[PDB]
């Protein structure tokens with residue numbers, strides 16, 4: 001019937017992730033989403049934001065307490081630094097018992113700075129009985145879904161093997177004197193493994209509809225000191241410490257078919273995912289949330305066939321969050337009208353419809369932990385039970 | 391001393407085999423420097439047949455290993471037989487060879503033996519015999535391997551930030567030629583994805599980068615236990631055969647020099663090879679369609695790609711040719727012998743080089759079994 | 775860029 | 780050549 005009332009923690013018109021992605025989506029989908037509540041530590045900014053965006057329905061709350069309690073909210077969105085997720089969401093969840101209308105809790109990836117915090121958060125979310133949503137928007141990319149479709153329909157045949165090559169961000173030999181210090185210190189929830197590799201390995205499991213059984217990882221900090229740089233792209237003859245990793249080696253096996261997976265992630269061509277099937281090979285590529293290109297190959301007298309799938313002018317960064325929101329709306333308003341559906345689901349798993357949940361994020365955090373665990377202990381781990389309960 | 395190296399062959403056969411396609415054509419070209427004086431087969435009729443088909447005007451067909459290995463008409467023995475028979479033939483041969491004061495070189499094909507144990511015994515015995523040894527790791531003589539090795543060593547690409555390797559190898563995929571030896575598909579017979587395709591490749595890698603590994607981790611697969619037989623047309627004969635050798639190898643590790651990350655994937659199928667070396671100043675890529683064909687250099691408001699490709703270079707016979715060349719040069723112009731080539735440009739790979747490689751290959755299997763990352767930084771100094 | 779968070 | 784060449788040893 002009526003639009004979904006959205007309360008935002010982390011929406012800021014001046015800066016941040018939510019203004020570039022979440023807002024533009026909620027803007028397009030005004031018929032279905034409405035922002036009714038903002039919370040910042042500084043109330044002046046919440047208010048400033050409401051005026052710059054002319055949020056004719058937004059109320060700027062002064063406290064987490066007040067915000068989380070308000071019954072003018074159907075969905076809360078958390079879009080703040082990962083290091084503050086746990087400290088803000090655990091309280092918020094307690095307070096939120098004073099809102100009978102709360103239905104959805106939407107949290108950005110990563111969920112927390114550690115598997116422990118992530119478990120606590122998931123536990124608490126369940127106790128609260130709301131539907132949850134994590135921001136693994138890769139699951140909504142047009143490329144990922146076509147690939148998944150092709151694969152699940154037998155178009156490449158059985159998966160023989162997979163290779164992944166990846167590039168990570170500012171974890172090369174250089175750092176913008178701009179970018180913060182919290183990005184480059186371990187345990188703050190943002191890094192090569194948790195982020196770049198997290199998003200990628202997830203879409204891999206999702207496209208192939210399989211989890212891992214065994215994995216082995218080596219994690220590197222071969223670049224402990226980074227070279228600062230300006231906006232011109234020139235070095236400022238200044239060095240800064242970096243405790244987060246600059247390289248990740250990862251190999252493992254998928255449960256379904258015991259498929260070999262070789263992966264390399266570097267800190268500095270953004271992304272290549274090579275899936276070799278018995279009938280066709282499938283390749284996904286990137287440059288500069290993309291993923292921007294999908295390619296399929298087939299093999300006196302032989303024929304070769306190349307299928308390219310490319311959306312000419314597509315903005316993945318806003319594109320994927322959009323489709324995530326759209327997918328939440330289609331679930332709420334039941335656009336494909338299936339009267340026979342309950343109001344809530346634990347996880348998406350490998351289903352096409354719906355969206356990733358905190359349970360999906362938890363499983364991922366479990367896989368991330370196991371990676372680090374593998375590296376330190378220097379051993380190959382059996383991870384095939386991760387993804388059992390909660 | 392102005393005299394040609396007199397060569398005794400075990401495994402030279404004019405009808406079939408590796409040595410006829412590679413070793414012989416080389417020895418043919420280099421007649422001024424190499425001469426075949428002795429053949430041994432289990433069947434003397436074939437040794438003789440070979441001598442006549444090739445008009446080996448100086449060849450004597452010996453009836454027994456004993457007689458062959460003892461003959462003093464031989465300066466270099468070459469072993470080019472199935473890997474599974476190396477140990478059983480070389481250990482005796484080495485004993486007998488004490489009756490030849492002229493023996494100077496022992497040349498053995500890769501792989502050395504079916505196991506690290508056999509390989510150790512063989513190396514031990516080779517040392518006790520005091521001859522110069524040579525293993526057939528001929529990639530160490532590829533023009534491409536050498537160019538890449540130079541560029542790298544002259545700092546032309548900067549520091550190595552990371553390495554990726556992708557290989558396809560042999561008939562270890564879904565299909566297998568109907569006329570094809572059963573033994574090369576049963577594990578422990580010295581021929582397989584790891585020992586062979588990966589052996590040769592990882593070796594040239596260590597050689598190009600002048601570094602051994604410190605830590606490694608491997609997963610080895612047999613996801614294809616039954617293979618589909620095929621004819622010469624390339625069509626399936628609706629028949630299946632067991633295969634206990636691997637169809638996939640995952641390998642990751644670190645090089646000692648610089649602690650460089652190395653990601654490797656090897657598949658059983660049938661783009662042969664890509665070796666991607668990422669340096670601080672440039673990228674270097676080696677490709678093939680498992681004998682390297684092509685070397686690419688990438689550097690940098692403008693981008694540059696440079697391709698080094700020799701034309702009419704046959705790598706199969708050419709790299710083996712070049713190995714005999716360096717053995718010839720050695721016997722004639724130039725320590726009297728060495729332990730190993732290590733990362734040197736000149737000289738040739740020896741049994742010690744092969745041993746170190748067998749040690750790494752053993753570790754690969756050990757890592758897969760133990761299920762843990764291993765420290766291999768000592769295998770270039772002493773036992774595993 | 776804001777995407778590096 | 781879809782046969783077992785001598786190089787496959």
Ligand SMILES: NC(=O)c1ccc[n+]([C@@H]2O[C@H](COP(=O)([O-])OP(=O)(O)OC[C@H]3O[C@@H](n4cnc5c(N)ncnc54)[C@H](O)[C@@H]3O)[C@@H](O)[C@H]2O)c1
Pocket residue numbers: 009010011012015016017018039040041045079080081082084088108109110135136137190289776777778779
């Ligand atoms: N690919 C992706 O899905 C993607 C990309 C980038 C960032 N992210 C995630 O989105 C989240 C937000 O990133 P960001 O750079 O916008 O973070 P941010 O902390 O800078 O933005 C949150 C905003 O909320 C306010 N705020 C800051 N700390 C707060 C606190 N503890 N309590 C209440 N309000 C607070 C501030 O005004 C800030 O502008 C992070 O978890 C990040 O990992 C995801």
Ligand SMILES: NC(=O)c1ccc[n+]([C@@H]2O[C@H](COP(=O)([O-])OP(=O)(O)OC[C@H]3O[C@@H](n4cnc5c(N)ncnc54)[C@H](O)[C@@H]3O)[C@@H](O)[C@H]2O)c1
Pocket residue numbers: 400401402403406407408409430431432436469470471472473475479499500501526527528785786787788
């Ligand atoms: N370096 C490379 O890239 C490369 C490539 C292919 C093969 N090889 C190696 O070359 C060697 C020879 O391979 P091959 O397939 O030609 O061997 P092969 O056994 O099939 O042929 C060698 C010949 O030696 C004779 N012979 C066989 N068994 C013998 C024994 N027990 N005692 C004495 N003589 C015997 C036979 O006449 C046979 O024709 C093997 O070690 C193989 O691994 C190396």
